[PDB]
Every structure is written in structure tokens, then in C-alpha cells.
Write a protein that binds this ligand. Structure first.
Ligand SMILES: [Ca+2]
Ligand SMILES: [Ca+2]
Ligand SMILES: [Ca+2]
Ligand SMILES: [Ca+2]
Length: 411
């Protein structure tokens, strides 16, 4: 595996900035990557013939229908191995290529209600980090047609709940049909700040359409309350739109309605392990022809196409909120249509958006800090409206300009 390379969106070879891992580069290799919108170059880390690690910078090319709050873009890179690199042979290329995409999802819980200056909302009602890894479990890289299988590893980590009524967070893995998914592994975990993982529930390699794992009687070590908490992770691979993943139990994370969870100054719990949902989806083996190409594309497009990661939240009563331009689940579809029907403030042609192009959710770089309770998002991020109002043309790195006193970091 010493010849395989790692590609990052940052000079720092941080795990968060990894775009594609364990890549075989025989002569040259062109890859489509999902990169930060402002990103113009990528960094290939490689093993040298002396045993050290080196970095080579690569320029990005454009890949070729309006602005929709994307902090990412599609780009292309042509990798080439420098002459001092570990040269590939079957002795040094034993590794699976994997795509990587991570970010932080920030939701407002009030849909269909919003301030006219929608960015005056605090956007911390549900704050969760996600991490997606799609591994190509193939015997050899760079094939015309391929056997083996794909794997998907998703983590959903609850960072904060700045609302009284949010109950669920989830994602639709759009296009990831049941025909493509053989097994589901689903885990509820407490994610410690220094790499320690505590399992709350787990079901391994299930062939079920619906895998439900739950722990309805857990507490953090040295917890601030004696009352037990609960978490329910449901993986439904059999929905028409793709795999539907939900993490229920968000209401049990706070201690009271005034403070809520990880949002109120003086009440944030320092270094608190994060509630984590972890899902491993193992692709069907032995699928062939056109359908096999369709399967590999379905796993790949979840990382490549940002629009396939249909994140959402639920609030008490079952109301489902998605980001602008993202569809309700098939189950909520009828309710969504009945709800929006008489509302003059909502755009009838765009999902979950007011008539002035608002959103109730944003997907940001994973390190982006959320706002303190009732602090307007545009005050926590002074360059946000510049990016919004220029429709992503200016201040593409607006998320890097946060105001310390208006934002939280406890991890
Ligand atoms: Ca090989
Ligand atoms: Ca809010
Ligand atoms: Ca809030
Ligand atoms: Ca500070």
C-alpha cells in the first residue's frame, strides 16, 4: 500500500481535508473531486523512495442550475507520480481507493415560519457534523468494468440542539437503492474528543430492509442529570428515494428548555463526547453489466454530487425540514404539499424556500462553529450576507471569518 497516494484540499494533511485516499497513480490519473468552492489547488501526499512523506501541489480544472448555498464545487485533477515516489507494483499497491466528504449541517427549526431577514435566525436549532467515506472494495484500481463491491461509511455527530422542539436529524442517501445494498451495520456511539468511542447499541451486517438500533436508558459519564437519555437509529434501505437514515432522541440531550444543548453561554459542556450515529452500508456483490455500472455510480455520486446528500431534521409532531431545493422524504411528501399549498410566503417552485430564496438549512466546512442561542447568524459571520447576496460570487471563505464572542467551540 506504500505507492498509493492521498489527496487533500489543504497543505495540512488533516483527515478532515482528505478528498480521496489510497489512490493508485500508474503514469497519470484524472479524478473528479468534490472540493471547497474557493479551492483552486489540491495537495497529493506520497511516500518517497527514502521512506519520508512528500507533498506535490496540483492545479484544479473545472468540471462541466443557479446558486443554492453550496460551499463546495466539482473539480478535476490529473495526478502524476514524481520520480522520487514509491513506484507502483502489485507488492506496493494493495489498498482500496476511498472518496471522502465531511461538513457541518446547521438547521433552523421554524419552517414554514422565518424572519424576513432570514439570516437574522441563529441557525443552531440542530447542529450536526457528518462524515461520508465511499470505499471501492475492488481487487485492483483503474478497471474498465469491475467486480468486488463498494462500502459506505457514514457518521452523524450531534454538536448542538438550539431548539426546544427538534427531535430527529437524518439523511436521505439519494439514489442509493436497496438493490445496491446487501448489509447494514448501524451503531449508536458516544464520540470522545480524544478518539475514545463508547458503544450505546449496535446491529452488525443485517440483511433487513429496516435496521433499528436503540438505547433508551443511557447517560454521559458524570452526567448533569440523573434522568436517562435516549437515541434511536433507523436505517431504511427500501425507500423509493434511496436509503433513509434517522437519529431520534435529540430532545433528551438538553437538561432543560431554557439552556437547551451546547448553545447557551455559561451552560456549554466542555469536551462533552458527541452522540454519534454510525452506518456502514455494504454493496451487493456479483451485480453485472449496466446495473453494476449503475451501482458503482450510485455509491460514487453520494460523495461527488452534493445534491444526493439530502440532510433533514424533524421537530415534535413529525414536521420534516430539508435545506433549500431538497425534497421531502416520500413518507412526508403528501404532508409537505398540503402544508405549503395555502402559503403565499413560500416559493411554489423551490423546495423549503421563501419567495426571496431563503433557506432553513446550510451545509458548511466541518470546522465551522455554530452561533450562541438567539445570536443572528449574519452577526456570528459578518461576511455571510456578502456571499448570500452575491449568490456565492464573493466571500467564498466567509465561514473562516467568525466572531469568537458570537460562536461556540467546545471540542
Ligand atoms: Ca495490485
Ligand atoms: Ca433558530
Ligand atoms: Ca436556536
Ligand atoms: Ca472565546
Amino acid at each position: 500500500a506504500s505507492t498509493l497516494v492521498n489527496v487533500y484540499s489543504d497543505k495540512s494533511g488533516s483527515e478532515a481535508s482528505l478528498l480521496v485516499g489510497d489512490v493508485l497513480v500508474k503514469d497519470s490519473r484524472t479524478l473528479t473531486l468534490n472540493v471547497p468552492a474557493a479551492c483552486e489547488k489540491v495537495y497529493m501526499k506520497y511516500n518517497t523512495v527514502s521512506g519520508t512523506e512528500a507533498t506535490k501541489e496540483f492545479a484544479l480544472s473545472p468540471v462541466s442550475t443557479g446558486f443554492n448555498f453550496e460551499t463546495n464545487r466539482l473539480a478535476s485533477v490529473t495526478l502524476a507520480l514524481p520520480e522520487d515516489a514509491v513506484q507502483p507494483t502489485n507488492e506496493t499497491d494493495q489498498g482500496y481507493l476511498f472518496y471522502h466528504n465531511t461538513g457541518v449541517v446547521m438547521f433552523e427549526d421554524g419552517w414554514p415560519i422565518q424572519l424576513d431577514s432570514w439570516y437574522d435566525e441563529d441557525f443552531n436549532d440542530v447542529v450536526f457534523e457528518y462524515d461520508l467515506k465511499v470505499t471501492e472494495c475492488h481487487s485492483q484500481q483503474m478497471m474498465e468494468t469491475v467486480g468486488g463491491k463498494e462500502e459506505l461509511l457514514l457518521t452523524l455527530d450531534v454538536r448542538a440542539v438550539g431548539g426546544i422542539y427538534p427531535t430527529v436529524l437524518g439523511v436521505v442517501l439519494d439514489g442509493l437503492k436497496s438493490e445496491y445494498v446487501d448489509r447494514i451495520t448501524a451503531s449508536l456511539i458516544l464520540k470522545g474528543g480524544q478518539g475514545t468511542m463508547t458503544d450505546l447499541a449496535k446491529e452488525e451486517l443485517s440483511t433487513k430492509n429496516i435496521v433499528k438500533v436503540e438505547n433508551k436508558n443511557w447517560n454521559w459519564s458524570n452526567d448533569t442529570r440523573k434522568e436517562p437519555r435516549f437515541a434511536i437509529l433507523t436505517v431504511d434501505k427500501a425507500q423509493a428515494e434511496g436509503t433513509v437514515i434517522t437519529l431520534d432522541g435529540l430532545t433528551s440531550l438538553m437538561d432543560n428548555n431554557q439552556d437547551m444543548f451546547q448553545v447557551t453561554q455559561g451552560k456549554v459542556r466542555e469536551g462533552l463526547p458527541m452522540l454519534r450515529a454510525e452506518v456502514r452500508l455494504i454493496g451487493k456483490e456479483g451485480l453485472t453489466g449496466a446495473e453494476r455500472d449503475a451501482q458503482l455510480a450510485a455509491f460514487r455520486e453520494l460523495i461527488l454530487d452534493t445534491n444526493r446528500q439530502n440532510f433533514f431534521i424533524k421537530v415534535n409532531g413529525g414536521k420534516e425540514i430539508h435545506m433549500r431545493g431538497y425534497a421531502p422524504t416520500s413518507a412526508y411528501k403528501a404532508e409537505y404539499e398540503a402544508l405549503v399549498a395555502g402559503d403565499t410566503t413560500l416559493d411554489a417552485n423551490v423546495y423549503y424556500s421563501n419567495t426571496k430564496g431563503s433557506t432553513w438549512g446550510v451545509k458548511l466546512p466541518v470546522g465551522t462553529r455554530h452561533a450562541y442561542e438567539r445570536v443572528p447568524f449574519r452577526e456570528a459571520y459578518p461576511d455571510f450576507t456578502k456571499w448570500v447576496d452575491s449568490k456565492g460570487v464573493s466571500n467564498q471563505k466567509w465561514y473562516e471569518n467568525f466572531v469568537d464572542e458570537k460562536t461556540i467551540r467546545y471540542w
